[PDB]
Amino acid sequence: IVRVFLPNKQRTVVPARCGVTVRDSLKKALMMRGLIPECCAVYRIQEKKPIGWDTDISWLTGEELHVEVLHNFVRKTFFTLAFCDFCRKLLFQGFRCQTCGYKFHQRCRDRSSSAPNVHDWEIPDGQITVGQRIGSGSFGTVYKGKWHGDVAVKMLNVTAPTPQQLQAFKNEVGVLRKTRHVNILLFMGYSTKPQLAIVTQWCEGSSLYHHLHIIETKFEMIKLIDIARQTAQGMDYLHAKSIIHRDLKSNNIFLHEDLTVKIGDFGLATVKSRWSGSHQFEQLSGSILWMAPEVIRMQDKNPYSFQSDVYAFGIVLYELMTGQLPYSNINNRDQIIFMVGRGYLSPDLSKVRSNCPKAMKRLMAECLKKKRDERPLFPQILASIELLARSLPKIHRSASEPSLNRAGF
Amino acid sequence: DKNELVQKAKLAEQAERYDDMAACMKSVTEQGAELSNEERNLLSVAYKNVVGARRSSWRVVSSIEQKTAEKKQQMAREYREKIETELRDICNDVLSLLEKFLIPNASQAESKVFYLKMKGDYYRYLAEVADKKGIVDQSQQAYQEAFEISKKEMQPTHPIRLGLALNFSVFYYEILNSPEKACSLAKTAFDEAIAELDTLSEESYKDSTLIMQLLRDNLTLWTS
Amino acid sequence: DKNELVQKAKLAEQAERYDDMAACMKSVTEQGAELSNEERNLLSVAYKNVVGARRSSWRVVSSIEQKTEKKQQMAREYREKIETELRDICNDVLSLLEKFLIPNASQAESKVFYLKMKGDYYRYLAEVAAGDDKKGIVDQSQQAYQEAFEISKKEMQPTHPIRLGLALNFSVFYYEILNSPEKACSLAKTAFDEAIAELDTLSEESYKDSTLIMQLLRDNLTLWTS
Ligand SMILES: [Zn+2]
Numbered sequence: 084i085v086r087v088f089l090p091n092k093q094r095t096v097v098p099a100r101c102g103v104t105v106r107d108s109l110k111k112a113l114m115m116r117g118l119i120p121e122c123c124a125v126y127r128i129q130e131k132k133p134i135g136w137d138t139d140i141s142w143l144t145g146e147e148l149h150v151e152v153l154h155n156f157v158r159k160t161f162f163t164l165a166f167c168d169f170c171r172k173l174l175f176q177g178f179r180c181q182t183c184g185y186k187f188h189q190r191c192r193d194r195s196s197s198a199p200n201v202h203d204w205e206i207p208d209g210q211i212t213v214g215q216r217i218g219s220g221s222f223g224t225v226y227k228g229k230w231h232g233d234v235a236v237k238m239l240n241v242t243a244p245t246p247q248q249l250q251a252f253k254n255e256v257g258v259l260r261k262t263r264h265v266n267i268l269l270f271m272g273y274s275t276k277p278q279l280a281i282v283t284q285w286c287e288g289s290s291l292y293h294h295l296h297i298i299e300t301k302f303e304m305i306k307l308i309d310i311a312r313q314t315a316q317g318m319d320y321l322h323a324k325s326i327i328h329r330d331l332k333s334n335n336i337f338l339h340e341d342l343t344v345k346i347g348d349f350g351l352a353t354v355k356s357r358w359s360g361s362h363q364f365e366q367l368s369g370s371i372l373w374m375a376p377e378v379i380r381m382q383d384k385n386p387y388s389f390q391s392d393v394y395a396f397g398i399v400l401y402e403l404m405t406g407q408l409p410y411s412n413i414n415n416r417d418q419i420i421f422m423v424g425r426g427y428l429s430p431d432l433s434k435v436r437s438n439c440p441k442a443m444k445r446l447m448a449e450c451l452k453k454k455r456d457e458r459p460l461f462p463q464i465l466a467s468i469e470l471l472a473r474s475l476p477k478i479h480r481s482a483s484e485p486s487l488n489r490a491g492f
Numbered sequence: 493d494k495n496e497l498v499q500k501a502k503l504a505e506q507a508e509r510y511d512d513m514a515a516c517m518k519s520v521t522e523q524g525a526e527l528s529n530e531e532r533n534l535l536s537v538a539y540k541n542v543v544g545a546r547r548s549s550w551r552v553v554s555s556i557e558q559k560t561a562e563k564k565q566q567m568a569r570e571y572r573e574k575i576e577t578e579l580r581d582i583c584n585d586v587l588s589l590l591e592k593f594l595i596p597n598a599s600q601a602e603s604k605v606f607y608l609k610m611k612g613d614y615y616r617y618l619a620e621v622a623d624k625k626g627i628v629d630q631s632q633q634a635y636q637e638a639f640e641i642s643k644k645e646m647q648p649t650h651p652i653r654l655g656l657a658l659n660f661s662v663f664y665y666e667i668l669n670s671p672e673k674a675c676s677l678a679k680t681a682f683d684e685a686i687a688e689l690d691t692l693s694e695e696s697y698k699d700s701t702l703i704m705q706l707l708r709d710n711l712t713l714w715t716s
Numbered sequence: 717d718k719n720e721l722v723q724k725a726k727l728a729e730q731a732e733r734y735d736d737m738a739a740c741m742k743s744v745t746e747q748g749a750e751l752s753n754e755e756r757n758l759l760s761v762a763y764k765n766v767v768g769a770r771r772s773s774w775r776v777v778s779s780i781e782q783k784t785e786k787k788q789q790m791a792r793e794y795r796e797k798i799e800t801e802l803r804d805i806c807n808d809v810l811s812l813l814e815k816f817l818i819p820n821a822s823q824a825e826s827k828v829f830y831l832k833m834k835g836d837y838y839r840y841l842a843e844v845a846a847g848d849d850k851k852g853i854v855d856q857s858q859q860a861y862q863e864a865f866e867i868s869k870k871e872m873q874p875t876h877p878i879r880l881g882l883a884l885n886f887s888v889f890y891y892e893i894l895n896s897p898e899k900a901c902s903l904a905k906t907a908f909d910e911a912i913a914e915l916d917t918l919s920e921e922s923y924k925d926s927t928l929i930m931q932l933l934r935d936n937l938t939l940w941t942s
């Protein structure tokens with residue numbers, strides 16, 4: 084007999100006679116949870132020689148099997164805007180599927196493209212009414228107070244002045260001043276003469292982490308997509324000017340009374356990795372849930388290279404479609420660092436909610452992929468959501484009767 | 493001309509122009525030849541998209557219909573009526589076709605199940621758009637006749653059987669409000685296949701697992 | 717009424733079926749009032765997808781027509797069956813863009829887009845004809861952009877999406893239809909770079925459409941240079 088280390092935190096004793104190969108013996112047990120000999124992979128200890136499916140198991144008695152997971156092509160003509168999913172260009176015709184949701188490429192003459200359809204701040208002391216500090220976080224301390232109203236000031240950790248560092252902030256505050264947006268919080272100003280209590284707008288409303296674990300109230304999943312879209316759009320604009328968040332958490336995110344999400348309390352890669360001279364070499368901070376595998380490694384000289392924020396978004400998708408944080412079973416800060424950066428551990432995706440579209444479950448297969456070379460930039464991630472944000476009344480039924488492959492390889 | 497009706501339907505298959513397969517194949521079923529597996533399949537692929545895409549068109553119009561002066565509602569309500577009548581006429585086209593020449597000349601045991609499966613299937617779309625009791629009970633009786641023929645002739649590891657099991661099961665949950673009947677139907681059909689997975693063919697392996705996958709994906713979904 | 721036609725258009729847009737809206741919007745063009753921007757792109761999208769549906773229909777059947785003798789005739793006859801449908805609908809909207817909305821207008825940029833459509837749809841008809849049957853259309857299309865394109869480089873800033881929209885469409889007009897990449901390459905780089913120096917003010921006029929077309933220029937050029 085042989086073991087199996089199933090995803091979804093399960094394990095089932097299974098038999099293994101002679102002659103029968105890998106495929107059927109496991110498939111008789113693999114299928115009970117929705118697998119197939121061509122969507123999974125297992126490895127043996129030697130240190131992981133790939134044990135496929137054709138191979139004979141006559142020499143695999145008393146063994147351990149971690150079954151770690153690795154379509155039918157209807158046609159359509161994408162009326163609304165919709166991007167490809169093999170090169171992430173703009174796609175007009177092409178294949179699809181009723182369940183997966185994944186487009187496919189069509190030239191692998193090569194027709195051209197067309198136009199897609201459509202639809203300074205000086206602040207002196209005197210108005211600074213600073214109150215109790217909220218708490219620590221990603222890059223330091225925050226202070227709820229009052230400046231021209233209920234506006235959240237924010238005092239950094241390393242407030243040690245450097246006359247050239249203020250110029251660096253002038254480089255990082257001027258860029259991060261005029262970028263207004265529907266979602267992003269309207270930044271106000273900076274405390275100049277007193278120590279830097281950044282004047283970032285404060286309002287009412289509950290946070291996302293506050294909304295899911297302190298009270299832990301969920302709604303109808305129609306609103307769930309609303310959260311995964313506006314935060315894909317609000318943070319899309321930040322990457323439109325290359326302004327990475329660098330601290331995307333389920334904490335700073337706000338909700339404007341079930342109307343629209345609001346993102347903020349971000350930026351300032353100068354105070355982070357403070358000037359020890361003329362250098363700003365970076366460091367890890369806060370927690371490593373939102374932060375990315377190639378930021379864990381400490382060897383990313385520019386960690387937020389337009390993709391480390393994509394992984395931060397995904398760790399918000401997982402908090403959206405599971406109601407629980409990642410790694411509620413491993414609760415040690417120092418050790419999870421070792422097992423996430425080197426690639427030994429990735430969030431267990433086979434525990435996600437059951438009543439969510441397969442397309443977004445495919446979105447997390449890329450928006451949470453450990454590599455930074457195949458993350459879909461927020462341009463593509465933004466567009467994908469409206470595709471299945473208006474496609475709610477289309478696949479809401481029970482997995483009925485699908486057609487055949489309709490495509491030949 | 494029947495083969496001339498073939499090329500004009502397979503070509504229309506990959507054109508997003510399916511109303512040309514409604515015309516072509518409906519004119520093949522009303523000839524009097526033998527419905528081979530290929531043209532049998534194209535009939536299912538043609539109408540399903542023609543009625544399913546129009547069915548799914550109704551659902552989106554339905555969601556906005558319930559999301560509310562009455563001027564906005566009456567316009568959405570009117571469009572709901574317009575697609576509704578098109579749905580019945582594009583489904584009764586199949587329903588009348590089913591009476592005329594399809595079933596009474598069924599040649600094979602597995603074949604008649606395929607049509608008998610479709611009978612109830614096309615009633616289901618008509619049933620859920622609806623005056624009401626007469627349509628829904630006929631569907632079930634059409635399904636029940638498919639049920640009767642299925643268990644005693646249809647193999648337990650065949651896509652049609654599973655698809656009929658799938659459809660008949662999802663019929664219970666959505667229209668007949670009997671999930672316990674559905675999950676029992678799904679589990680029973682699914683389990684026997686798991687015992688029979690050791691014996692199949694590559695020509696039946698592909699579509700079979702997809703239905704079971706959805707059927708198992710259906711199994712997990714209704715558990716809660 | 718008028719808003720009932722407009723409202724029905726939006727509802728038809730909802731359900732993946734724009735043929736119903738196109739016949740409803742084609743009535744909107746035949747009203748006689750001043751078309752406005754919000755439903756103006758509804759005019760653009762309506763026939764674009766309706767034609768695109770037939771374009772996708774023609775583009776695939778053309779492939780199997782060349783991928784082949786009675787069977788070839790079946791493809792040959794059907795291909796012309798949809799080209800007439802493709803041409804008739806294009807002629808239906810070409811009548812729209814000629815005798816209906818070009819005369820009544822008072823804002824240059826509003827005239828720019830419709831003139832872009834005139835060059836667009838004439839170009840669309842130019843994709844199906846051959847030899848002599850297209851010269852009267854291609855020349856008509858070229859003037860529609862040239863009239864608008866001169867208004868583009870003069871009367872509107874490079875940030876506005878339509879000028880880039882007029883740029884990307886007009887450039888490909890040279891490569892595929894007119895087979896003149898050199899004027900396309902020069903215009904593409906010019907339109908993109910003259911629009912890359914003034915990207916400071918975006919949110920006041922949706923940044924979305926800009927970067928898509930802006931990106932759609934470089935990657936197109938990446939193909940246009942290889
Ligand atoms: Zn592609």
